[PDB]
Design a protein around this nucleic acid. Structure first.
Ligand SMILES: Nc1nc2c(ncn2[C@@H]2O[C@H](COP(=O)(O)OP(=O)(O)OP(=O)(O)O)[C@@H](O)[C@H]2O)c(=O)[nH]1
Ligand SMILES: Nc1nc2c(ncn2[C@@H]2O[C@H](COP(=O)(O)OP(=O)(O)OP(=O)(O)O)[C@@H](O)[C@H]2O)c(=O)[nH]1
Ligand SMILES: *P(=O)(O)OC[C@@H]1C[C@@H](O)[C@H](n2ccc(=O)[nH]c2=O)O1
Ligand SMILES: [Mg+2]
Ligand SMILES: [Mg+2]
Ligand SMILES: [Mg+2]
Ligand SMILES: [Zn+2]
Ligand SMILES: [Zn+2]
Lengths: 73, 186, 929, 187
RNA sequence: UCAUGCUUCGCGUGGAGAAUGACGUAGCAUGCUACG
RNA sequence: CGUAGCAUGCUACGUCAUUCUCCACGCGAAGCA
């Protein structure tokens, strides 16, 4: 519904980040892992969505990694 | 199961027997007909096993080739197939903050650090044009991720501090874009 | 107050110390205290109500109440004279409480009174009982003892769980604040025994006749003998006291100069490894009148009972010596003229010093077997490595084998979106639904393996009640009498999968297949013969698991080197197979749940108990927290099948190899070597079968503690009262094994305490009336045993009870039980958590497994596991199985379409249609085959 | 099979039977010739069964000998590899310190755990946070295991060089912990 | 990138048994011809 | 009644060919505890 869509999306977001070689930055990878695991173990949806905002900011920060215009066409 | 030469004999031989019972001829004729029919049936049933084995081997080969091709295709396009899935699912969620930040990123207004969640929050964002600046900023309040932030410092593209009064309609060309804006969560 | 005040004045007794009646003047005071009792009628270690003593509390000049009590008792006129005489004999000993004997007029005639002066409120028996029968629901004696001696403050216990060893590891410091008092008590006991021996007195010492200052009183059962032939009896005293010595770290002062806690530590010689003289000195200092021979080195022991007896004392005494002196002992040999450094012995914490019997100085050439032995040896690897100081763990770090530290992460799972979309379209995952996703792949960062390894901080040195353990082991060996074991040849061994890792350093040259092919059967037999005279230390690798879970933990398993596994198989596999091939026993390894096996197992555990109730548990972090003594016990129980193929020396060296390989060996974690404190290495050859031995050992201990702490005077049945009396005798008064009583006690347990054991999982069917009357163990007895013998607090989330047998155990091997009609009769079926099956469908560990068209047989197994959910009263549970069948059909349709598109030939497979119909899966739970 | 002479007898019998059938013989000769054909075919099949059995037996031993010859090669390879690994580690250890400490042993035996402590020339320290660094390896020289160690390198969890000036309480949040410190035994 | 247990699926080798077809040797029974 | 010749019916053994049921191992893929 809505709480199951957030967790399945966080899994895929962390998979995408792991392909962009974020593990090379230990400090950033630790934060991403913490956000992902805290979303998986969540009971309230507002907490999950705020953590998703935080986790997606990681992808949007590294601008050259992906092009949003083609992906959001 | 026709199309085999052996069958073309067997059936024909069988035909004789089908007629033979009607004739009711001497016993020896019946026995020789039975022998011929059994020989033809044995030939056909020995030849059918060969075609069955060939068909099973062909099916095995087809399945293995399909599996190898599909595995290679799945592994090859793993990076491109995941970003599309991610953005499809993000569109499905249709959240407000997520849509806000993605629409901003499409215009180049991207964050420099991880968007914090606490009141004592440090945010740094890049504003690459005046239109986007006026769309997101008005006075000393910054709207991003469906929250409100207080602007602290607006560093020019050459690291020189910019006063919020300078950024206006006619000073878009004078300043060096993109600007970097520092804000604290309100 | 004429009568009640002139009594207090005389009780003062020329000491003139501020007395204040605790009671009501001249009347007796009632207390509820722990006693160690054995007479013709009763025997046990329980709490009794005593009403024979008046108590007066002493106070200070400032009118403050202090911990000094005058205890005045009245008794017969003959006991009065007897005690007076014995006291006059022992008066001068400084370990004797000061007595005063007088006579007072109570009503109209003289009554003789014996007054013991300046005693503590509680005794040593109270402390031992409080710590060995711990109940967080009511621990008032324990709290008062902790607060009276400045171990902690009264507001310490307002913390949510101050008692848990894992949630509050600071409780160990509070308990360690009691060590010096217990050490002083031991010293005074030795003084008292010397006084008895020199004065010529014979008697039994009990914990309840000594206070917490270490002073002794009573003397009512002491006989008089020749003035040099006294005989103290100290067996139950020491044995009951033993578990508290390692919990309070009593002997810590032995690490200081002059055994003084204010002086600095001792600085030992760094090259010293033989502490036999120190061990003997410690034994003579504390356990002087313990009258069974102590062997500091267990290579000199007479049997496995002797090995346990002396390894217990070694465990105690090893806490005083530097940690750098334990482990492999190395020596310089010459091979063809070049010098090597190789292991020629081993210093164990429990077994003492061991030396190899085949050490070849000045060799000429190494064959394949010698190369294998020298390569697996940690000596060469550690000698040439760098020094390491890892501050991320309290574990002892040996060396770094590289110039870099390795950090390894755990990746997330792969999302199978097609199955998730299908399930959603079928009506799953809606808000407010009983079936929701709970099992995921949790990702970890680069400090994961080291953290899971550091969880070994929960393993602590634990000294046991040796007299209790020596009976429990004999009873535990009765559950393993239907099996057959012994050594096999190298060509009789069965290796299930040869494509596994061979361990460090062998994993850099090939798999286990490489080494099983390179070695001939003669080489393997030569290696096995070698391990019966020599010790081969081994390096173990720590490998992270990648599995789906509902918890955030990341588990590590132990990859043991092939040198250890190859010989351990040849030593244990026959008994392992015999256990795994048996039906109807307590251990249910090797029994399938399909084709009616679950129903058979439940009907076998139910047996014919009288007032049945079910209970069960699951150990928390079983391998990290397991004591070393119990692991050695489990290893010794399994080797009792080698009474004809091996001698005592061979069996000791097999034990030493196992200990040096999977109990305290070197561990490689990220390119660095650490020393494992203890526990079990999950990944050795006997892990699942040693877990079962440990489990039933803990259960038998719980039952013994339940029966021996019951008031014997209030047992109605004469059979059970006689059983308790005999149990106490066989534990603390009998030295040799009594086989008849072991048979009797085993039959009692089988009749009233039926068990079903699988590794660290247990289901018990027990007689509720006996358990309520204290005749068999309960869940609380089990919790007490685990607290004082395992160093873990078991919470109510890891244990369960069930008063209705028609609904089966709550859980067992992650399965729930359902009583359903199957044809004509009712049977028990296992079903899983629906979330587990759905999560396995949705999240996978490989990208190619997200294409179901390549993995149709993957979903058939999940549907097999999910079939029993169709018979659940909840409808979503039933819908999971139908969802899986429909998805299987959809996958086959898609596969046929793809075959006809890519190629142009139809597959012609009219056999798969059985996989999306429920008959194929119903046949898997019917007793037909 | 074709090579085996029994095929010749079978072919001769079949040819004789066919010729007699074409010649329209009386009947008894035809019966004798069909008997000859039957017995010849039976004998030929009996021998062909043995021929196929021998073929399979011969074909199933080449695999065995190839497997054994390859296993011997792999055994030699692993033997050489283990020997080379053992001999390389011989020269990676400083002989003087080891000899000095192992001659002071009363019987030649020493604990293993004290070898790197007293003999190793390089020390590696893994520091998880700043307080541990302050209490453990502060400055360019520290003391450990009754020896003096001079710091020669510091890197972070990403294997990037870190300068000793960057290691301060306020700058700690900007570092990727843990830090790995490499030092050499002084004097 | 471990130890164990159970289960499903596919391929192969072999042993035992079941059914069917062709052919052979021997034994018994019945029918016809030549001779003693 | 015996010798020789031919025809049919039945029994025993042997030999291969074809299909099917169970089992013992071998090899590969997967699931669960
Ligand atoms: N130290 C101590 N013990 C006490 C006190 N009050 C009661 N007791 C108990 O009473 C006992 C003292 O009396 P004992 O001399 O041991 O007499 P007993 O062993 O009860 O002997 P009987 O009663 O004759 O069977 C101790 O063992 C304690 O358990 C007290 O204030 N201090
Ligand atoms: N060798 C090996 N042993 C395992 C594995 N999984 C479980 N075990 C053994 O089974 C024992 C009990 O397993 P669990 O109850 O899951 O694990 P645990 O360590 O007790 O952890 P919790 O009970 O969940 O706190 C463990 O201690 C292991 O020894 C495995 O994958 N490999
Ligand atoms: P399930 O509830 O996963 O575990 C039940 C029991 C615990 C453990 O001793 C044993 N087990 C489980 C999983 C595994 O891979 N190995 C293993 O020995 O079964
Ligand atoms: Mg007493
Ligand atoms: Mg457990
Ligand atoms: Mg378990
Ligand atoms: Zn001994
Ligand atoms: Zn043996």
């Amino acid at each position: 519904s809505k709480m199951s869509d957030v967790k399945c999306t966080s899994v895929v977001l962390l998979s995408v980040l792991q392909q962009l070689r974020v593990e090379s930055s230990s400090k950033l990878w630790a934060q991403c892992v913490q956000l992902h695991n805290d979303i998986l173990l969540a009971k309230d949806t507002t907490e999950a969505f705020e953590k998703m905002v935080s986790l997606l900011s990681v992808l949007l920060s590294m601008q050259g990694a992906v092009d949003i215009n083609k992906l959001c066409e | 199961f026709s199309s085999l030469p052996s069958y073309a004999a067997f059936a024909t031989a069988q035909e004789a027997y089908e007629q033979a019972v009607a004739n009711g001829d001497s016993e020896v004729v019946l026995k020789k007909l039975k022998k011929s029919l059994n020989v033809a049936k044995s030939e056909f049933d020995r030849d059918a096993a060969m075609q069955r084995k060939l068909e099973k081997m062909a099916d095995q080969a087809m399945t293995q080739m399909y599996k190898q091709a599909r595995s290679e295709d799945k592994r090859a396009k793993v990076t491109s197939a995941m970003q599309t899935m991610l953005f499809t699912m993000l569109r499905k969620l249709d959240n407000d903050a997520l849509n806000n930040i993605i629409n901003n990123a499409r215009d180049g207004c991207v964050p420099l650090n991880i968007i914090p969640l606490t009141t004592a929050a440090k945010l740094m964002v890049v504003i690459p044009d005046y239109n986007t600046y006026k769309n997101t900023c008005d006075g000393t309040t910054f709207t991003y991720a469906s929250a409100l932030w207080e602007i602290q410092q607006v560093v020019d593209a050459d690291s020189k501090i910019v006063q919020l009064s300078e950024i206006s309609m006619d000073n878009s060309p004078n300043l060096a874009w993109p600007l970097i804006v520092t804000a604290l969560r309100a | 107050s004429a009568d009640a005040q002139s009594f207090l004045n005389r009780v003062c007794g020329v000491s003139a110390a501020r007395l204040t009646p605790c009671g009501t003047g001249t009347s007796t005071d009632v207390v509820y205290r722990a006693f160690d009792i054995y007479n013709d009628k009763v025997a046990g270690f329980a709490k009794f109500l005593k009403t024979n003593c008046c108590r007066f509390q002493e106070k200070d000049e400032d009118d403050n109440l202090i911990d000094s009590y005058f205890v005045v008792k009245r008794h017969t006129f003959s006991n009065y004279q007897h005690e007076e005489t014995i006291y006059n004999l022992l008066k001068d000993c400084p370990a004797v409480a000061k007595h005063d004997f007088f006579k007072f007029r109570i009503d109209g005639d003289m009554v003789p009174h014996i007054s013991r002066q300046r005693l503590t409120k509680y005794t040593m028996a109270d402390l031992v009982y409080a710590l060995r029968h711990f109940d967080e629901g009511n621990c008032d004696t324990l709290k008062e003892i902790l607060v009276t001696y400045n171990c902690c403050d009264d507001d310490y216990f307002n913390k949510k769980d101050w008692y848990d060893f894992v949630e509050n590891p600071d409780i160990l410091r509070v308990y360690a604040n009691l060590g010096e008092r217990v050490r002083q008590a031991l010293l005074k006991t030795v003084q008292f025994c010397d006084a008895m021996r020199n004065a010529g007195i014979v008697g039994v010492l009990t914990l309840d006749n000594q206070d917490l200052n270490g002073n002794w009183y009573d003397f009512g059962d002491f006989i008089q003998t020749t003035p040099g032939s006294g005989v103290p009896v100290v067996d139950s005293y020491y044995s009951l006291l033993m578990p508290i010595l390692t919990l309070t770290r009593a002997l810590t002062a032995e690490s200081h100069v002059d055994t003084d806690l204010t002086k600095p530590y001792i600085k030992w010689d760094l090259l010293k490894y033989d502490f036999t003289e120190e061990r003997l000195k410690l034994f003579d200092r504390y356990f002087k009148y313990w009258d069974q021979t102590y062997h500091p080195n267990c290579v000199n022991c007479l049997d496995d009972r002797c090995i346990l007896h002396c390894a217990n004392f070694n465990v105690l005494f090893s806490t005083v010596f530097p940690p750098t002196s334990f482990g492999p002992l190395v020596r310089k040999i010459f091979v063809d003229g070049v010098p090597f450094v190789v292991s020629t012995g081993y210093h164990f914490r429990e077994l003492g010093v061991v030396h190899n019997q085949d050490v070849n100085l000045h060799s000429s050439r190494l064959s394949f077997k010698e190369l294998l032995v020298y390569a697996a040896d940690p000596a060469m690897h550690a000698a040439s490595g760098n020094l390491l100081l890892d501050k991320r763990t309290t574990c002892f770090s040996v060396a770094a084998l590289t110039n870099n530290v390795a950090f390894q992460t755990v990746k997330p799972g792969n999302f199978n979106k097609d199955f998730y979309d299908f399930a959603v379209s079928k009506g799953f995952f809606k808000e407010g639904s009983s079936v929701e996703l709970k099992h995921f792949f949790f990702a970890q960062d680069g400090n994961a393996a080291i953290s899971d390894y550091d969880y070994y901080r929960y393993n602590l040195p634990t000294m046991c009640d040796i007299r209790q353990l020596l009976f429990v082991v004999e009873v535990v060996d009765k559950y393993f009498d239907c099996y057959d074991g012994g050594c096999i040849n190298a060509n009789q061994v069965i290796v299930n999968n040869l494509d596994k890792s061979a361990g460090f350093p062998f994993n850099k040259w090939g798999k286990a297949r490489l080494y099983y092919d390179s070695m001939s059967y003669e080489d393997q037999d030569a290696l096995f013969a070698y391990t019966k005279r020599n010790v081969i230390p081994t390096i173990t690798q720590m490998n992270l698991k990648y599995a789906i879970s509902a918890k955030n933990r990341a588990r590590t398993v132990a990859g043991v080197s092939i040198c250890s596994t190859m010989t351990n198989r040849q030593f244990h596999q026959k008994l392992l197979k015999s256990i795994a091939a048996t039906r109807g026993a307590t251990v249910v390894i090797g029994t399938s749940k399909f084709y009616g096996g679950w129903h058979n197992m439940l009907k076998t555990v139910y047996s014919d108990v009288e007032n049945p109730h079910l209970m069960g548990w699951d150990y928390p972090k079983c391998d990290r927290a397991m004591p070393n003594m119990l692991r050695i016990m489990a290893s010794l129980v399994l080797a009792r099948k080698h009474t004809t193929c091996c001698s005592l020396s061979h069996r000791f060296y097999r034990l030493a190899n196992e200990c040096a390989q999977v109990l305290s060996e070197m561990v490689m974690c990220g390119g660095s070597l650490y020393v494992k404190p203890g526990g079990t290495s999950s990944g050795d050859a006997t892990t699942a079968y040693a877990n079962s031995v440990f489990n039933i050992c803990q259960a038998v201990t719980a039952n013994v503690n339940a029966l021996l702490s019951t008031d014997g005077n209030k047992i109605a049945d004469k059979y059970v009262r006689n059983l308790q009396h005999r149990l106490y005798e066989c534990l603390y008064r009998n030295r040799d094994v009594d086989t008849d009583f072991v048979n009797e006690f085993y039959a009692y347990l089988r009749k009233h305490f039926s068990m079903m054991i699988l590794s660290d999982d247990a289901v018990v069917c027990f007689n509720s009336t006996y358990a309520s009357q204290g005749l068999v163990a309960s869940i609380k007895n089990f919790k007490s045993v685990l607290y004082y013998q395992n160093n873990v607090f078991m919470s109510e989330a890891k244990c369960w009870t069930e008063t209705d047998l028609t609904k089966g155990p709550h859980e067992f091997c992650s399965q729930h039980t359902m009583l359903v009609k199957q044809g004509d009769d009712y049977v028990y079926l296992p079903y899983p958590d629906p979330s587990r099956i759905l999560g396995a469908g949705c999240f996978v560990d490989d990208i190619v497994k997200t294409d179901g068209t390549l993995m149709i047989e993957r979903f058939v197994s999940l549907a097999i596991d999910a079939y029993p959910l169709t018979k659940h009263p909840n409808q979503e549970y039933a819908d999971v199985f139908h969802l899986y069948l429909q998805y299987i059909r959809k996958l086959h349709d898609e596969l046929t379409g793809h075959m006809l598109d890519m190629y142009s030939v139809m597959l012609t497979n009219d056999n798969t249609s059985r996989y999306w119909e429920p008959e194929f899966y119903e046949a898997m739970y019917t007793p037909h085959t």
